[PDB]
Design a protein around this nucleic acid. Structure first.
Length: 215
RNA sequence: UCCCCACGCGUGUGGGGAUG
């Protein structure tokens, strides 16, 4: 019960306009990153996930990219990013294992009244959403004295211009992006692996949903 | 929360959102 996927670390170059474009617009980032696994996506063998990492200093922006298939970063423009070699990742997941995690996700609900997806409003609801999704996904958010072992380090409403070739009007993608960090435990290694590989919650094409775990 | 899909228990649930 090991599992496999590929992780790539990209260190983006603020001097590059293409990098700045993608850092500011998760949908454009989606378009850039997709090229690295273009044929796998078309063959229906791929689920690309990524996260723009929180910066804690003046360091350059770091983007973590997970793919099910081996990525080809030769597609990146010269100067766009420094690319660390994609590396096969075999997550160690066994029942009861405690792990630190980071997840930028879209805690949302589809309103009965409007049929539309909207953001859950309060921190309590965002945390409950995470607890629910983690448990359904074979993990479990740790609960220590002082509450759930999670912190919400960022909570922002994204309004992102979206445009595909052949489309006359460019739509506006609007999604709430919540950055969670904390501690969880593995419950069911197989379901937990599927959750790492498939991602958690909406907006996966927009740099949300990548559950990253580590001892 | 702008669009699309799946659905028989949820604040409706889940999935999708390149070919510049």
């Amino acid at each position: 019960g090991t599992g496999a996927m590929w992780l790539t670390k990209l260190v983006l170059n603020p001097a590059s306009r293409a990098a700045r474009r993608d850092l500011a617009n998760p949908y454009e980032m989606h378009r850039t990153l997709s090229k690295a696994v273009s044929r796998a996506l078309e063959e229906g063998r791929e689920r690309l996930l990524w996260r723009l990492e929180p910066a804690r200093g003046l360091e350059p922006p770091v983007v973590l990219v997970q793919t099910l298939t081996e990525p080809d970063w030769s597609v990146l423009d010269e100067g766009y990013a420094q690319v660390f070699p994609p590396k096969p990742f075999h997550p160690a997941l066994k029942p009861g294992q405690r792990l630190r995690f980071r997840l930028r996700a879209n805690p949302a609900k589809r309103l009965a009244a409007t049929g539309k997806r909207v953001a859950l409003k309060t921190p309590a609801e965002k945390v409950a959403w995470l607890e629910r999704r983690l448990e359904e996904g074979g993990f479990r958010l740790l609960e220590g004295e002082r509450g759930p072992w999670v912190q919400i380090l960022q909570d922002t409403f994204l309004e992102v211009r979206r445009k595909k070739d052949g489309e006359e009007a460019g739509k506006l993608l609007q999604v709430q992006a919540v950055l969670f960090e904390g501690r969880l435990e593995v419950v069911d290694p197989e379901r937990a692996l599927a959750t790492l590989r498939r991602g958690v919650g909406p907006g996966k094409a927009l740099g949300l949903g990548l559950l990253s775990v580590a001892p």
